Every structure is written in C-alpha cells, then in structure tokens.
Amino acid sequence: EVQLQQSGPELVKPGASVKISCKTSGYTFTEYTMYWVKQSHGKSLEWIGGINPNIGDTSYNQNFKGKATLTVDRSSSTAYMELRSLTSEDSAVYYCARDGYPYYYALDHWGQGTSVTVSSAKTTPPSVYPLAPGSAAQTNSMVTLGCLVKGYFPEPVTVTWNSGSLSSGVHTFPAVLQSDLYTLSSSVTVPSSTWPSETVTCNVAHPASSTKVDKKIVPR
Amino acid sequence: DIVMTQSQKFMSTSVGDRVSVTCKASQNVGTNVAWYQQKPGQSPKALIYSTSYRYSGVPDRFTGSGSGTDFTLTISNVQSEDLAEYFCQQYNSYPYTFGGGTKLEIKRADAAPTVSIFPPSSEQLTSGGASVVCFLNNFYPKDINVKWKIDGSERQNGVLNSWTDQDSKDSTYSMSSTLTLTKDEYERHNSYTCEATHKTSTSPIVKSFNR
Amino acid sequence: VFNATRFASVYAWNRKRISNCVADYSVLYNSASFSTFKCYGVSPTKLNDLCFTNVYADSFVIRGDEVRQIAPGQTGKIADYNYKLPDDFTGCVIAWNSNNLDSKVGGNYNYRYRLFRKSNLKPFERDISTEIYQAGSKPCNGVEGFNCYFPLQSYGFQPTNGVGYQPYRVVVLSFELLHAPATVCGPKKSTNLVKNKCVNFNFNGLTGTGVLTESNKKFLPFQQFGRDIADTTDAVRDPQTL
Amino acid sequence: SNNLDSKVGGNYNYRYRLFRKSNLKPFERDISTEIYQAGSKPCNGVEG
C-alpha cells in the first residue's frame, strides 16, 4: 500500500528555519518525481518546486527561489524541504506529492500536510469569560448563551458545553487574531424550560497548557 | 506565467442535480490539465487528469470535456460526499499554476438570522478591557453585512468577524462579531446596537441594549 | 573486429557478418592478450570442431563493471538500454583491456552510451535515437528541463580510471544453426602421404582402408575418386596434390 | 529431500564435477580435486 507520512505541526519564531519530511513507502522512490506545494488559509493553492531523485534536477518557482530548498535522502527514502527567512506570510500547510508519468497519469497523490505557523508569542493559557443573556425571558421562546476566550496560544481549545452532553445547537466559531493572540466564542441554544432553573456551564480546556477551567452561566 | 481564473467561487446545488465547474487559461495550455478534490481539513485527492480520464478509486460520474481554453468538470448525480473544494492545474510550462478554487453548497430556503447581543460581564469589568459580542445564527444565504453603530455612529476599528462553514445537519450558516474597546470607552456612551442587513427583508434586523 | 582501429559506441554496437570461410579460434585461446574469455554452451577450443551457418561479432567498448552485464540473464544500463542479450545466449565473450588503447586524458568523448531510455531493448537490438528522455508528465518539446534529459552520455574512459571503469573492447561472437547449409567451419588437419603400406584413409569426403599406390589413370580436373563395376572405390585424387 | 539436504546458505557438502580430462567409465568413482588444465600453460595447483 503506497503511503506518504509527513511530520507534526511546528511552532516557529520569525527568521528561523524548519525541515519538513515526507516518508515514502510502497513504490520505487528513485524513478518517480516528487513535488512540494503550499496552501495558505482561505486563499488559492500555489506550487513551489519539484525534485528528481535519480538525478537531482530542481526547478523552483520564481517567487520561492530564495525561500525553499529541497534535498532527497535515498538511504531512507525521505525527502526534505528547508524554508529560510520566514515572515508572518508563511502561515500555511505544506504537502508532499508524487508524479505518475510512467503509469499513464498526471497524478500528484498528495500526502497529509504539516501546519506550520509563525508567531513571536509564548504559549499563554486561556481565560474564559461568560456572556450575559441576561436576566430573564429574552426572548420568550429560545434564549441563547455563550462563553468567550481571549489571549491563548496555540490552536486549538476544546470547548464543551455541560461537559460534553449539550449538543443541540453548539456553534464554535473559528479563531481570529486581534493582538497576535487567538480568540473565539461559542453559541448554544438552551430552551426556557431548563434555564435558569438548571445549571448550564461552559468547559474550555487547553491541551498545550493542561489547564481545565469551567465557568457557570449566571443570570444577571 | 499562466493565470488560471475560476468564476465564480461559490456554487449551490442540491442533491441529485447537475453541476458544472469551469476554469479558464491565459495561453495555449493544450490538453494537459487536471482537477482535484479537497475535503475541509483533509488532504486533496486527484479526480480528473488530461480532461478526459479518471483515476483509480474515483467515481465514474466525474467527467470532463473541453480543450484549449475552456475546461468543464461536470458532475451528474451529486451526493453529500461531493461537498469539497475543487481546483484546476496545468502541466504545460513550469512553474505549475494552480487555479482559484470553487466550493459547493446545498440549496436551502430563505431564513432570517436570529441576532443576539451580549454585554460584557462583571468579570470583564474587572479584567482590563471589555468586548461586546453579537451572535448571528441559522441564516441563509452566505451574504450578510453587519454594522456596529455607537449612538448612531458606525464604528470601524476593532470590529472583528468570524464566519463559519456550513452546518452538516441543517445547511445553515453562523457568524459572530467581536467589538473590542477599553473600559472608559465602554462607559462613555449609553447605547449599543448590532445592525445586520439581509436579502430576506427590506429593513435590517435591529437589536440593541442600554447602559 | 577484435583489432579494429576505432570501435563503435555501445548503443551504436557494430555487427560484422562472417561466413563462407574458415575460422581459427585456437590462436585466440592461446593468444594471451585478453582479460577474459567465456563461451556459453561450448568449449572455446572445441569451436574448431563444429560448423555453423552464420557467425556475427558484436563489438563495442564498455567499462569494467558493465562486463558482467554482458551475459544471458543480466540487468543493467547496457543490458537493457544499449545492448541487451537474450536468455539463451550460446555464443562467446572475449575481453581486451583498452585502458592503454581507448582511454583519453579527461575522458574519451568519442564513445557514448544511452544512459536513459523510455523502456528496455530486445535481444541484439540497437537504438541510435537522440530523443529527449521524458521521466515526468511534462513535455520536453525536444529540449531539456524538468525530467527531460539528452539520453546519450559520454564516457569517463581515462588513465585515472580503475579496473572497473577503464574501457574494455568487448566482442560477443554470435552463432547460427539454420536449415540453410553450413558455411563456416574450423580448420582441418592433415599429414604426409604414405604408399605401399596398409593404412587407413580419411579424405575430404571419403574414408576407408587399404594400400595406396600411384597409377596411370587419367582423372578429369573435377573428378575426386573412382568406383569399379561393383560400385566399390578403387582410386582417389589427393586433395593437396593433383 | 528439500527439508533435509537443503540449506539456507547453500550446502557445500553435496557437490558435482564440472570439468574433466576425458570421459568417465561406468561405475568409476573420482575424487581428484586437481585443478583442471585446458590451455598450454601449466596450472601448478591454482586457477587462472
């Protein structure tokens, strides 16, 4: 079974350099040509370059000439991409590929992808903050609640409502950037027959800091 | 290099319907183009190469035609697994120029959003800053325009937004609006409102709170 | 073939047809001017005892490491792309060291080889094409680039090269046994001529036993022997003396 | 007897003759490990 396995996600400071691997198994690594690409968040795809393992010929894109270099290790069937002079514009995922010309193809056969983010901030634990609906009967049919996070790094956090039991209309909005630190919110819909008679709480956990914090929604 | 243009970027077709994805080229690419399929978060897989041939494992409903300038990826009987991101590539001259991308959507009835504003809590009042949020849930279609008015004056700084992808159960959108500001600027004015317009009504949906 | 002035390339392997003549192989086995001599199916010295229809000699120069690829059931750049051999080869292989003959300071550029081919050759096939070899899904358009290379490559035959990299004038001696008549044979022997003595006879196309003497019989220029009324031999013309 | 006489790295014990100076006779054992000569030059107990 032909399988391409890449590395894990790397947090890196600006100006440094990283090495992204793509291990290969299931086929003859010498003949087939390997490409490398880059997909930024929300925008179109872009191509970087390609390397040939039997010879070593390279042809990079003109916008990535002083950005990335490629090396192939035939002793372990592992390719490598080394990025240099990183800036905040390289917040993207990077895939490995495989050409298919000696099989009557035009195939790329993409791998998994390594999420490489850039920042200059130490990992900060989150701080939850509840939302005031507020007091009572707003509206009379269905009342919405919520809980914010502010100032945390890195993605993601696990926002569970009522310790993972309430799931009838949970809308965890994606994270944005306001002060080089991520923030998001969540929106739930609890009917009037249980609030504020019963306790509805918001549980946000951070796997990168191992901090468990919960805040009960209080009617105010 | 070659500029591969895709128009439009959004398309909405229900299940059991015929959809056509098109993208143009700048120069004479010839025949060698491609098409891909990218699930949200997952890795892209290949669907069509050289605009007339499928791959090993893709369904037979993905057919392609066209040569020279226009290329069309037509799907006959779409499904729930058809919702992905579709790109087009060229193989004529190095470097390879990918396309823009087209996302598929499910058609739904028109529904107005249910706006909800949340003033900052007492824990925000003793923290260092304040932020008032305006949730918008279960609306269709995607086009919307939120406007934070501060006693009749539209505020533009610190007004951040965060849209969502389509829900896989009701095919509705959701979005949120975070307005960040300091302490005394929150208690400088007396009212705050979350104006949001839509095509489902002439006048925009109004909600507000005092103090 | 073995002592040619300028050999051909490997992808341009020359072939010279030999037939309708005698071939003395014993001088080669006792030449002691060859790095290797290997005959498949038959002994090298026994070649003087057999007869064949057609005999070819495929000549080319290769590096020392590629010599093992010159055999039936091999694999390599030459065994696949420049000069492939069949699985039932029963000819011969002779190796001469050309490190002092065909070597050149800075590599010998007169000799080249198809280091890249779209696929493999056939037995005794030759490919003298100069098409740019495509390895990727991109088109070469006759010129080079990403996965597009001129297939033929020069050699590094040099005095600096080692035993496995110096040139070697290779000569593969092909043989043929067709329904057509035998045209090439080894050299035959002979001896002096005895008379007035009971001895055995083994002439060019006649054998037997008896006493041999001179005679006054008048043979024709094309007559070899004679027979009596009972269809029994009673005379013979000596093949080396009329 | 591929399960008994065989061997992963090749059985050296079971061998055969490859060359000879003449034809063997019926029921004639031969255990001469002498280096077979084929040319004119002497062998003197070594291949070459």
Numbering used by the authors:
A (entry chain D): 1 to 220
B (entry chain E): 1 to 211
C (entry chain C): 341 to 582
D (entry chain B): 438 to 485
Paper excerpt:
The spike (S) protein of SARS-CoV-2 is a glycoprotein that forms trimers protruding from the virion surface and mediates viral entry into cells. The S trimer uses its receptor-binding domain (RBD) to bind with the host-cell receptor ACE2, followed by a substantial structural rearrangement to fuse the viral membrane with the host-cell membrane. The Delta variant harbors multiple mutations in S protein, including two substitutions (L452R and T478K) in the RBD, the D614G substitution, a cluster of mutations in the N-terminal domain (NTD), and two more substitutions near the furin cleavage site and in the heptad repeat 1 (HR1). Here we present cryo-EM structures revealing two conformational states of Delta spike and S/ACE2 complex in four states.
The 8D3 Fab binds on the tip of RBD-1, with the CDRs of 8D3 forming a pocket wrapping around the RBM loop region including the substituted K478, while the other substituted R452 is not involved in the interaction. Since the loop is also a part of the ACE2 binding sites on RBD, the association of 8D3 Fab to this region could therefore competitively block ACE2 receptor binding with RBD. Our further structural study on the Delta S-8D3 Fab complex revealed that 8D3 binds the RBM loop region with its CDRs forming a “crater” to surround the loop. The residues N501, K417, L452, and E484, where mutations frequently occur in VOCs, are either outside the interaction interface or not directly involved in forming contacts, explaining the neutralization potency of 8D3 towards Beta, Kappa and perhaps Alpha and Gamma (P.1) as well. The Delta variant contains a T478K substitution located near the center of the 8D3 binding footprint, but surprisingly 8D3 can still efficiently bind the Delta S trimer and RBD and neutralize the Delta pseudovirus. Moreover, we identify the previously generated MAb 8D323 as a broadly neutralizing antibody that potently cross-neutralizes Delta, Beta, and Kappa variants.
